[PDB]
Amino acid sequence: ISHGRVFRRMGLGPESRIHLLRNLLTGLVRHERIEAPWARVDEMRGYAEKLIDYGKLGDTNERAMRMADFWLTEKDLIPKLFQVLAPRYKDQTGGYTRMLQIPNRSLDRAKMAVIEYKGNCLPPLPLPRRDSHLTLLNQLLQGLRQDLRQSQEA
Amino acid sequence: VKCTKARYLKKKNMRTLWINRITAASQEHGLKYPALIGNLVKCQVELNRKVLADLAIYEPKTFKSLAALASRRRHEGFAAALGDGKEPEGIFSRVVQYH
Amino acid sequence: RGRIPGRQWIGKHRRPRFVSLRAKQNMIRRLEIEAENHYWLSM
Amino acid sequence: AAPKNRRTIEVNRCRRRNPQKLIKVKNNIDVCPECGHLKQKHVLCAYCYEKVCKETAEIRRQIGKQEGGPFKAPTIETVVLYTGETPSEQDQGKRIIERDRKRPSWFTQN
Amino acid sequence: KSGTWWDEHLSEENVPFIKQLVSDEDKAQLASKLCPLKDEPWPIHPWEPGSFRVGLIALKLGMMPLWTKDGQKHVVTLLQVQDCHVLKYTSKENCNGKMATLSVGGKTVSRFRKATSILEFYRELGLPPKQTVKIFNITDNAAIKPGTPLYAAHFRPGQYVDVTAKTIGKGFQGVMKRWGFKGQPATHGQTKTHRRPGAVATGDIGRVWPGTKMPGKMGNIYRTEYGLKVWRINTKHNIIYVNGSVPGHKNCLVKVKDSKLPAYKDLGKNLPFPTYFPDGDEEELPEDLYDENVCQPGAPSITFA
Amino acid sequence: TARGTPSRFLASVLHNGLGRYVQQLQRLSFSVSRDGASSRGAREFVEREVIDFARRNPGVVIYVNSRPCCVPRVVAEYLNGAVREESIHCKSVEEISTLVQKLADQSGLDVIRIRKPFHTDNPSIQGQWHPFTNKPTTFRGLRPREVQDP
Amino acid sequence: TMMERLHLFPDEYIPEDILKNLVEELPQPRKIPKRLDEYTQEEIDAFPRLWTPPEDYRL
RNA sequence: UGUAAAUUUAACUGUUAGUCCAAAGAGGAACAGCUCUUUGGACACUAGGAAAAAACCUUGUAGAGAGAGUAAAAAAUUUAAC
RNA sequence: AACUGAACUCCUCACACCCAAUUGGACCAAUCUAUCACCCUAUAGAAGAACUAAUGUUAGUAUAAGUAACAUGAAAACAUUC
RNA sequence: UCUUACUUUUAACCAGUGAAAUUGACCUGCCCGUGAAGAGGCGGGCAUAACACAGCAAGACGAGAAGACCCUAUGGAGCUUU
RNA sequence: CUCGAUGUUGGAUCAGGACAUCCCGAUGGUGCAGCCGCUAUUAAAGGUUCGUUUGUUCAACGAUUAAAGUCCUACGUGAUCUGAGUUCAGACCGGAGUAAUCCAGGUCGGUUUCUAUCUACUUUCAAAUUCCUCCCUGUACGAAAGGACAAGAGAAAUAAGGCCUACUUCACAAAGCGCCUUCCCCCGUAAAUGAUAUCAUCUCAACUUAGUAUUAUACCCACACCCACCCAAGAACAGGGUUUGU
Ligand SMILES: [K+]
Ligand SMILES: [K+]
Ligand SMILES: [K+]
Ligand SMILES: [K+]
Ligand SMILES: [K+]
Ligand SMILES: [K+]
Ligand SMILES: [K+]
Ligand SMILES: [K+]
Ligand SMILES: [Mg+2]
Ligand SMILES: [Mg+2]
Ligand SMILES: [Mg+2]
Ligand SMILES: [Mg+2]
Ligand SMILES: [Mg+2]
Ligand SMILES: [Mg+2]
Ligand SMILES: [Mg+2]
Ligand SMILES: [Mg+2]
Ligand SMILES: [Mg+2]
Ligand SMILES: [Mg+2]
Ligand SMILES: [Mg+2]
Ligand SMILES: [Mg+2]
Ligand SMILES: [Mg+2]
Ligand SMILES: [Mg+2]
Ligand SMILES: [Mg+2]
Ligand SMILES: [Mg+2]
Ligand SMILES: [Mg+2]
Ligand SMILES: [Mg+2]
Ligand SMILES: [Mg+2]
Ligand SMILES: [Mg+2]
Ligand SMILES: [Mg+2]
Ligand SMILES: [Mg+2]
Ligand SMILES: [Mg+2]
Ligand SMILES: [Mg+2]
Ligand SMILES: [Mg+2]
Ligand SMILES: [Mg+2]
Ligand SMILES: [Mg+2]
Ligand SMILES: [Mg+2]
Ligand SMILES: [Mg+2]
Ligand SMILES: [Mg+2]
Ligand SMILES: [Mg+2]
Ligand SMILES: [Mg+2]
Ligand SMILES: [Mg+2]
Ligand SMILES: [Mg+2]
Ligand SMILES: [Mg+2]
Ligand SMILES: [Mg+2]
Ligand SMILES: [Mg+2]
Ligand SMILES: [Mg+2]
Ligand SMILES: [Mg+2]
Ligand SMILES: [Mg+2]
Ligand SMILES: [Zn+2]
Incomplete structure (x- = not known):
């Protein structure tokens, strides 16, 4: 039974799980885009979002600095968090990362995902795009919308 | 070995089939199987069960006549048995003698 | 339930066999033949 | 515990060829509109993703040469500039990474 | 031949519009049924001994303590009626059973996730589709017109009810958790045998009886x-x-129903029959109905005098 | 097996014997060796028997071919197209005569299990039995428990 | 398979379709004996009185 | 008397760890599907019957038949007034 | 009062053609040799002369089974770092 | 008493690689009866569309070792001895 | 039958069955006043304790209980466990033997394998039993002592099925030591009326009553949106939700 168990069992135990997630998050902060097994990226994505919130507290908040010191194993990334990543998201309340599934890994056929911090300088991922508003179905719905708006104003 | 021994069963089952079919045909005329076979013999009719089964299927008018004949001979038997010897032999009960 | 001890038709306790009407008639039919044999062997 | 009897090929075919054992046909395959190669609806196109990764690797190699050592992440934003381009007004104060090629059409300058 | 879903082909602009459109229609349909007695109701017969009325479908909100005037603590479960409506009536003749049946549904669900046959059923009814539909055996005098809303005040304090639901799913479980078997000792030499069934039958029969308690889905x-x-x-x-x-x-x-236990038979003489019609109700009911023995939140502290 | 082999119904070739009898054996082809010991009995059959057998069967064309062979054979062909090859290796003259006469009398149909020892196209003269053959009819053909003129 | 061709009904009612396909009714195997109240006075008169009861017996 | 075997001569092998049934007995407990002798039968060869069935009953000599007459062959019973 | 019912008996045709150990007899696959034969044989003489079974010997391939079991710390520019 | 929760391993699913004992043939049900005396396979009944995956250990007198106990063999060997 | 092996005591685990019934139900008799008993008929749904010594099955003893039933199931069950005993190889004591060695003796120690091919089975869905307290009542009964039954009320234990408000182990949840629910019948006999047998007679006489359930009802019940995501659903599969698909 695992009702309401929100965390995965990975690595060699609870501590190793955190270390595994921390190394992934450190890679993400440096490179701003990484690929890893889908389950591990999904697990880490929550931490990557919350790290930005701590970064927004500022480098003078001692609690934020301690959190960043633990989670960033390469200390040159701590200035980047407080001075680059957190200011970039100053005008957002969330949704700092995007996660997309990529083809299965070659060796072990593991399900894979790419995760990146939005607003990076890297070439854009081939994001999925919704159908054009000019398609047959979308035009028929646009007509229905136009018709409903005209009847309400009357 | 099965093929060899089956030759006995084939003959046995064929005769069982003829008896079943004759029984059905006889019952359609209100006669039980033993009454038909027994009384036909008493009329010196030596038709075997294979032919009797064939007649029931493909010559139903001849079979009804045979059923009627057996029934007639059966009734003559009862009349004779009830009598004390006063009555002469039944018309269909007379046996043709050979020498 | 209703088991017969050991083998059915041997030993101390056996399955009971009963004499049917036709078994009786069969025996009497052969008794009559032998009785007549006695007669024809008397002269 | 060991098998009491050899299992016949008739029995084994029933087990091995049961529909549960067969590979199921996939109905979620489609053509990538950008490149024309095949993709699954919920998964990124393998061809397009590889193209993006290859350019991403070239840019990262250039970033390495500029940093020139471990533990040298900058404290400013970065922009990638291709041959024939110059820093915009919104690219001032940012680390410039220069690529010796023409801007890919799918890489829109922002 | 490839499968599709409702918003697969919709553009960025049309997804919000479609969501708003279907949502508003759902709300409008529910509001149009709020006056059953003004919409050609079926005959409202008086309660008679031996009569069985419809029940309700409710959602289990949680549990809460309450105290009685004698000082005793009773925990209770809160059951919220969420969009409960009568859906179908089947006459005693066509039911295949001894009694008539009335189908009730509960909780509105998305139309984008239901089978076409179900959607056309709800289209003719003029209601949004329901998550769960249950069948209530009723007497002919208790029939209610399809589409009538049902409310919590259908039941009254002091009544006894039976509640049927799916138990919590515990998956595949061993005999100890599933059946309360004792298992075997932890030490004194037990070899890889602590939570196992033990013997499952006798040697003679050379088989396992049907119904034998074994590990399985709980x-x-x-x-x-x-x-x-x-x-x-x-x-x-x-x-x-x-x-x-x-x-x-x-x-x-x-599924909430009047209790069928023999002691509670023929206690519906004072209960709403065939059901409670708030629109028909002459005097609006108070926001809370209490059993006579319940300590109400605003009542003075208990004193044993 | 019977189950392991084919079967057929008793039959004839072109209703043979109905209007006239036609011998179905049409051709006989012998292969005798001049010197082979296994053909000694076949050589004696060709010297005194084959000529008299041909006189009796003018509708059968006999082809005697003397050639080197270890196994002398007779091949019988019938009007229906059947071909039958029978070895006469080391057979006596009387044995060969018996075999050849048997081939002359056969129809050429397959010598396989015959399902029935009889055949007829007119099994019934009075009408084949059906469930109503011996059932009486009722007034107005009314069924059991059927109300008339309601 | 034979049991599928058997149609049992507890009372006189038979479905209309079943009734329309009926061909022949089989005679009942057991002759139902008549109750004493079902005998006609002709039958009762035909059976002789077998004994003379005493005139002074209360019965 | 009805029958066709018999002894002798020559030359060998295998069998010499036995079962039930009826009958006369012994041992045991007038137990054993028990043990030991005797007379006979059957089995260890066929087929049918006794539910299945080595040992009970019917029956043996060999093939084909889509004939026929038979053999053994089915369990009967129902009760206390004065 | 009969009928059913065997490999018993009759019927048409045919006949050496239903016991362990053992014993007598009639044939015979293939091989080599003598002489024949010459699309595969004949008369003889010979012999390492015939395999549904020895927890047989050797080889092949199944079954159990695609089962038990086995393996590579993480990201990245493959430099490096954690 | 009287068990419960969590972690790791195993586990199950995907991918790669891929053993062993075992195996007369199997189209491999339950009950009572029978029987070389404890039946999936016989008699009488009942049950019964087909085929996976996961568990279980009541039966297949389950697998493994030509019982080491016991007796037998004019079969051995170690030891002791008037 | 089995020695080319059918694993041998007691215990653990899970129990299937018989009734010749230990407790609970219904009755007849009594040297049955009552309270307790004894005996027999009927009843197998349900139940039938924890401990000290002993390897023990038993037995004795302590404390309870409505009662601590008798048996069968390869003296049920070791491919589920246990190994104290018993019954290998070491050793000691008493006894026997010239010795080797031995004994129904005692005593210390002494390896319990198996990855499940087949059969079978893996929610017989849902009516409950019992003790005690109060009351009846210090009543019926009885010289006294003693002392009920039926009805009624309450409170518990066990069993079955669920649940997490609080407590507790714990902490998006799983749990008990916690809480909630739990509903029909039992045929042995006792009596009328009334023939054979003009009284009588409860009747394998016709018949009437105690005296009976089609066990009641309850639960379950509509389905190619379904690529994908989430889940109180779950080994896989399946199932629920997505109007919660940047
Ligand atoms: K016996
Ligand atoms: K017999
Ligand atoms: K097993
Ligand atoms: K043994
Ligand atoms: K002890
Ligand atoms: K099996
Ligand atoms: K716990
Ligand atoms: K009387
Ligand atoms: Mg792991
Ligand atoms: Mg016969
Ligand atoms: Mg027996
Ligand atoms: Mg669950
Ligand atoms: Mg425990
Ligand atoms: Mg171990
Ligand atoms: Mg352990
Ligand atoms: Mg001797
Ligand atoms: Mg004996
Ligand atoms: Mg004969
Ligand atoms: Mg003969
Ligand atoms: Mg030859
Ligand atoms: Mg040899
Ligand atoms: Mg071979
Ligand atoms: Mg071999
Ligand atoms: Mg397996
Ligand atoms: Mg594994
Ligand atoms: Mg496994
Ligand atoms: Mg695998
Ligand atoms: Mg073996
Ligand atoms: Mg048995
Ligand atoms: Mg399985
Ligand atoms: Mg077997
Ligand atoms: Mg074994
Ligand atoms: Mg041995
Ligand atoms: Mg020697
Ligand atoms: Mg063996
Ligand atoms: Mg039990
Ligand atoms: Mg009793
Ligand atoms: Mg035992
Ligand atoms: Mg076992
Ligand atoms: Mg020990
Ligand atoms: Mg000593
Ligand atoms: Mg030690
Ligand atoms: Mg010891
Ligand atoms: Mg073990
Ligand atoms: Mg196992
Ligand atoms: Mg009382
Ligand atoms: Mg009276
Ligand atoms: Mg009277
Ligand atoms: Zn592409």
Whole structure:
């Protein structure tokens, strides 16, 4: 039974799980885009979002600095968090990362995902795009919308 | 070995089939199987069960006549048995003698 | 339930066999033949 | 515990060829509109993703040469500039990474 | 031949518009049924001995303590009636059973996730589709027109009800958890045998009897709790306070019916029949109905004098 | 097996014997060795028997071919197209005569299990039995428990 | 398979379709004996009185 | 008397760890599907019957038949007034 | 009062053609040799002369089974770092 | 008493690689009866569309070792001895 | 039958069955006043304790209980466990033997394998039993002592099925030591009326009553949106939700 168990069992135990997630998050902060097994990226994505919130507290908040010191194993990334990543998201309340599934890994056929911090300088991922508003179905719905708006104003 | 021994069963089952079919045909005329076979013999009719089964299927008018004949001979038997010897032999009960 | 001890038709306790009407008639039919044999062997 | 009897090929075919054992046909395959190669609806196109990764690797190699050592992440934003381009007004104060090629059409300058 | 879903082909602009459109239609359809007695209701017969009325479908909100005037503490389960409507009536002749049946549905669900046959059924009814539909055996005099809303005040404090729901699903479980077997000792030399069934049958029969208790899937089956007292009714939020616990997890749907236990037979003489019509009701009911023995939140502290 | 082999119904070739009898054996082809010991009995059959057998069967064309062979054979062909090859290796003259006469009398149909020892196209003269053959009819053909003129 | 061709009904009612396909009714195997109240006075008169009861017996 | 075997001569092998049934007995407990002798039968060869069935009953000599007459062959019973 | 019912008996045709150990007899696959034969044989003389079974010997391939079991710390520019 | 929770391993699913004992043939049900005396396979009944995956250990007198106990063999060997 | 092996005591685990019934139900008799008993008929749904010594089955003893039933199931069950005993190889004591060695003796120690091919089975869905307290009542009964039954009320234990408000182990949840629910019948006999047998007679006489359930009802019940995501659903599969698909 695992009702309401929100965390995965990975690595060699609870501590190793955190270390595994921390190394992934450190890679993400440096490179701003990484690929890893889908389950591990999904697990880490929550931490990557919350790290930005701590970064927004500022480098003078001692609690934020301690959190960043633990989670960033390469200390040159701590200035980047407080001075680059957190200011970039100053005008957002969330949704700092995007996660997309990529083809299965070659060796072990593991399900894979790419995760990146939005607003990076890297070439854009081939994001999925919704159908054009000019398609047959979308035009028929646009007509229905136009018709409903005209009847309400009357 | 099965093929060899089956030759006995084939003959046995064929005769069982003829008896079943004759029984059905006889019952359609209100006669039980033993009454038909027994009384036909008493009329010196030596038709075997294979032919009797064939007649029931493909010559139903001849079979009804045979059923009627057996029934007639059966009734003559009862009349004779009830009598004390006063009555002469039944018309269909007379046996043709050979020498 | 209703088991017969050991083998059915041997030993101390056996399955009971009963004499049917036709078994009786069969025996009497052969008794009559032998009785007549006695007669024809008397002269 | 060991098998009491050899299992016949008739029995084994029933087990091995049961529909549960067969590979199921996939109905979620489609053509990538950008490149024309095949993709699954919920998964990124393998061809397009590889193209993006290859350019991403070239840019990262250039970033390495500029940093020139471990533990040298900058404290400013970065922009990638291709041959024939110059820093915009919104690219001032940012680390410039220069690529010796023409801007890919799918890489829109922002 | 490739599968599709409702918003697969919709553009960025049309997804919000479609969501708003279908949502508004759902709300409008529910509001159009709020006056059953002004919309050609079926005959409202008086209650007679031997009559069986319809029940409800409710969602299990959680549990809460209440105290009685004698000082005793009773925990209760809150059951909220969420968009409960009569759906179908089947006459005694066509039911294949001894009694007529009335189908009730509960909780609105998305139309984008239901089979076409179900959607056309609800289209003719003029209601949004329901998550769960249950069948209530009723007497002919208790028939209600399809589309009539049902409310928590259908039940009254002091009544006893039976509640049926799917138990919490525990998956594949061993004999110890599933059947309460003792298992085997932890030490004194037991070899890889601590939670096992032990012997499963005798040697003679050389087989295992049907029905033998063994490891297997536990829970996730329908169970019924009988003889639960209705302590309180909140008419504003349509919540029924029932004594004790009911099967299922929080936020599951439960079938609530008048208790069939012999001691509670023929106690519906004073209950709404065939059901409670708030629109028909001459005097609006208070926001809370209480059983006479319940300590109401605003009552003075108990004193034993 | 019977189950492991084919079967057929008793039959004839072109209703043979109905209007006239036609011998179905049409051709006989012998292969005798001049010197082989296994053909000694076949050589004696060709010297005194084959000529008299041909006189009796003018509708059968006999082809005697003397050639080197270890196994002398007779091949019988019938009007229906059947071909039958029978070895006469080391057979006596009387044995060969018996075999050849048997081939002359056969129809050429397959010598396989015959399902029935009889055949007829007119099994019934009075009408084949059906469930109503011996059932009486009722007034107005009314069924059991059927109300008339309601 | 034979049991599928058997149609049992507890009372006189038979479905209309079943009734329309009926061909022949089989005679009942057991002759139902008549109750004493079903005998006609002709039958009762035909059976002789077998004994003379005493005139002074209360019965 | 009805029958066709018999002894002798020559030359060998295998069998010499036995079962039930009826009958006369012994041992045991007038137990054993028990043990030991005697007379006979059957089995260890066929087929049918006794539910299945080595040992009970019917029956043996060999093939084909889509004939026929038979053999053994089915369990009967129902009760206390004065 | 009969009928059913065997490999018993009759019927048409045919006949050496239903016991362990053992014993007598009639044939015979293939091989080599003598002489024949010459699309595969004949008369003889010979012999390492015939395999549904020895927890047989050797080889092949199944079954159990695609089962038990086995393996590579993380990201990245493959430099490096954690 | 009287068990419960969590972690790791194993586990199950995907991918790669891929053993062993075992195996007369199997189209491999339950009950009572029978029987070389404890039946999936016989008699009488009942049951019964087909085929996976996961568990279980009541039966297949389950697998493994030509019982080491016991007796037998004019079969051995170690030891002791008037 | 089995020695080319059918694993041998007691215990653990899970129990299937018989009734010749230990407790609970219904009755007849009594040297049955009552309270307790004894005996027999009927009843197998349900139940039938924890401990000290002993390897023990038993037995004795302590404390309870409505009662601590008798048996069968390869003296049920070791491919589920245990190994104290018993019954290998070491050793000691008493006894026997010239010795080797031995004994129904005692005593210390002494390896319990198996990855499940087949059969079978893996929610017989849902009516409950019992003790005690109060009351009846210090009543019926009885010289006294003693002392009920039926009805009624309450409170518990066990069993079955669920649940997490609080407590507790714990903490998006799983749990008990916690809480909630739990509903029909039992045929042995006792009596009328009334023939054979003009009284009588409860009747394998016709018949009437105690005296009976089609066990009641309850639960379950509509389905190619379904690529994908989430889940109180779950080994896989399946199932629920997505109007919660940046
Ligand atoms: K016996
Ligand atoms: K017999
Ligand atoms: K097993
Ligand atoms: K043994
Ligand atoms: K002890
Ligand atoms: K099996
Ligand atoms: K716990
Ligand atoms: K009397
Ligand atoms: Mg792991
Ligand atoms: Mg016969
Ligand atoms: Mg026996
Ligand atoms: Mg669950
Ligand atoms: Mg325990
Ligand atoms: Mg071990
Ligand atoms: Mg352990
Ligand atoms: Mg001798
Ligand atoms: Mg003996
Ligand atoms: Mg004969
Ligand atoms: Mg003969
Ligand atoms: Mg030859
Ligand atoms: Mg040899
Ligand atoms: Mg071979
Ligand atoms: Mg071999
Ligand atoms: Mg396996
Ligand atoms: Mg594994
Ligand atoms: Mg496994
Ligand atoms: Mg694998
Ligand atoms: Mg073997
Ligand atoms: Mg048996
Ligand atoms: Mg399985
Ligand atoms: Mg077997
Ligand atoms: Mg074994
Ligand atoms: Mg041995
Ligand atoms: Mg020697
Ligand atoms: Mg063996
Ligand atoms: Mg039990
Ligand atoms: Mg009794
Ligand atoms: Mg035992
Ligand atoms: Mg076992
Ligand atoms: Mg020990
Ligand atoms: Mg000593
Ligand atoms: Mg030690
Ligand atoms: Mg010891
Ligand atoms: Mg073990
Ligand atoms: Mg196992
Ligand atoms: Mg009382
Ligand atoms: Mg009286
Ligand atoms: Mg009287
Ligand atoms: Zn592409």
